Design a binder for this molecule. Structure first.
Ligand SMILES: *[C@@H]1O[C@H](CO)[C@@H](O[C@@H]2O[C@H](CO)[C@@H](O[C@@H]3O[C@H](CO)[C@@H](O)[C@H](O)[C@@H]3O)[C@H](O)[C@H]2NC(C)=O)[C@H](O)[C@H]1NC(C)=O
Ligand SMILES: *[C@@H]1O[C@H](CO)[C@@H](O[C@@H]2O[C@H](CO)[C@@H](O)[C@H](O)[C@H]2NC(C)=O)[C@H](O)[C@H]1NC(C)=O
Ligand SMILES: *[C@@H]1O[C@H](CO)[C@@H](O)[C@H](O)[C@H]1NC(C)=O
Ligand SMILES: *[C@@H]1O[C@H](CO)[C@@H](O)[C@H](O)[C@H]1NC(C)=O
Length: 218
């Protein structure tokens, strides 16, 4: 279980503990997954998506049953295998991001470029630049959100946790059905209950019993 981000990442001045990352509460390192929506023309191949998220093109290709050079149709949600590890008391998967345009902000990088796979708060905490001193060509340390199954989750049969970018219309019920797991396992993984509002566009942890399906929309 990890705290649910609960839209606290939408205000860069918000200081809720969840915004600085999942908490290191299990094994120091594990295999994990992110999700990411293909974006044309910059992030729509295994090469460019892996470059943004620090995976490998072969891992992205195999995870989605495509080749490592296959163009991915815009808005397709793909799975991205990554190593999740503990750093500074948090679980995260490191990536590096070079700003392309002077005008990009900590928030635009977290919310738009990385599709809320990281937060403004974690970016600011792990980079030296002032929010008013970012220029094209600056490299950012990007702490992508992932977690490793706790002992209790492992004992329940979950081999991985997957960081799931919730889309319009989706619910814990419908997301659990994609991965063939119980709705209650999804709720428990995020410390939610059936009355909790699950926000669109905010990452949600999904515990997995096996590797994710190659196509999420099936
Ligand atoms: C992902 O990124 C984090 C930082 O966000 C890396 O954490 C780093 O952890 C190492 C290991 O303790 C720290 O190294 C220490 O640093 C000093 C030099 O500053 C040196 O005396 C020693 O080598 C000492 O171990 C390091 O401080 C820390 N980095 C930061 C920026 O705080 C982590 O290793 C990264 N993980 C992966 C898998 O890339
Ligand atoms: C942060 O990102 C989200 C996308 O995850 C943006 O949400 C959009 O909101 C507008 C209305 O303001 C909708 O028309 C779009 O459909 C939403 N996006 C998606 C992908 O569905 C949001 O605008 C971003 N916030 C900022 C301040 O840039
Ligand atoms: C936030 O969490 C950290 C460790 O995850 C802890 O040291 C700190 O006390 C927490 N802060 C609050 C306000 O609960
Ligand atoms: C991969 O794609 C092939 C051909 O489209 C399909 O028959 C096969 O079942 C897929 N494999 C997996 C593991 O999804």
């Amino acid at each position: 279980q990890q705290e649910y981000l609960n839209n606290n990442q939408l205000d860069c001045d918000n200081t809720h503990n969840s915004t600085y990352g999942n908490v290191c509460n299990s094994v120091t390192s594990c295999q994990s997954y992110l999700t990411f929506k293909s974006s044309s023309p910059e992030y729509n191949t295994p090469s460019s998506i892996s470059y943004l998220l620090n995976s490998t093109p072969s891992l992205v290709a195999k995870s989605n049953n495509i080749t490592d050079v296959t163009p991915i149709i815009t808005d397709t949600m793909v799975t991205v295998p990554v190593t999740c590890s503990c750093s500074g008391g948090r679980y995260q998967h490191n990536a590096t991001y070079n700003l392309k345009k002077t005008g990009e902000t900590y928030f635009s990088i977290a919310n738009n470029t990385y599709q809320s796979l990281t937060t403004c708060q974690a970016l600011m905490a792990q980079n030296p630049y002032d929010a008013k001193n970012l220029f094209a060509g600056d490299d950012l340390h990007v702490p992508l959100r992932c977690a490793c199954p706790t002992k209790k989750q492992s004992d329940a049969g979950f081999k991985y946790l997957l960081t799931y970018l919730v889309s319009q219309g989706e619910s814990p019920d419908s997301i659990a059905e994609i991965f063939g797991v119980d709705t209650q396992s999804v709720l428990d993984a995020n410390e939610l209950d059936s009355k909790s509002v699950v926000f669109y566009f905010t990452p949600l942890l999904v515990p997995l019993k096996t590797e994710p399906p190659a196509r999420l929309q099936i």
